[PDB]
Design a protein around this nucleic acid. Structure first.
Length: 84
DNA sequence: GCTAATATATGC
DNA sequence: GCATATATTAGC
């Protein structure tokens, strides 16, 4: 399942890696910036969260479990990718 | 449920 | 004020 701390963990990660919502939204759960923004604003309790949300949150949780180094390379690649 | 567009906000 | 980032929400 998903932890109710996911929202804090995502906020913690954005700050740590100094990345934008767009970059994280794409690589972590394949969605756009505005969606992540709303997801973060609402901060819905995962226990009353729709299955669509749960899919997005679990995808974010799994991505955060990757090694720090791997997540950093992935962010960098996405930056260059959109840079084009 | 989302994306894409764009009004606002933020870091220099 | 330029370059990006984030908040909003119309249209699919």
């Amino acid at each position: 399942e998903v932890s109710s701390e996911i929202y804090q963990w995502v906020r913690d990660e954005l700050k740590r890696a100094g990345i934008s919502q767009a970059v994280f939204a794409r690589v972590a759960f394949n969605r756009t910036q505005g969606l992540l923004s709303e997801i973060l604003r609402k901060e819905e309790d995962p226990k009353t969260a729709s299955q669509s949300l749960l899919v997005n949150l679990r995808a974010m949780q799994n991505f955060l479990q990757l090694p720090e180094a791997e997540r950093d390379r992935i962010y960098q690649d996405e930056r260059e990718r959109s840079l084009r």
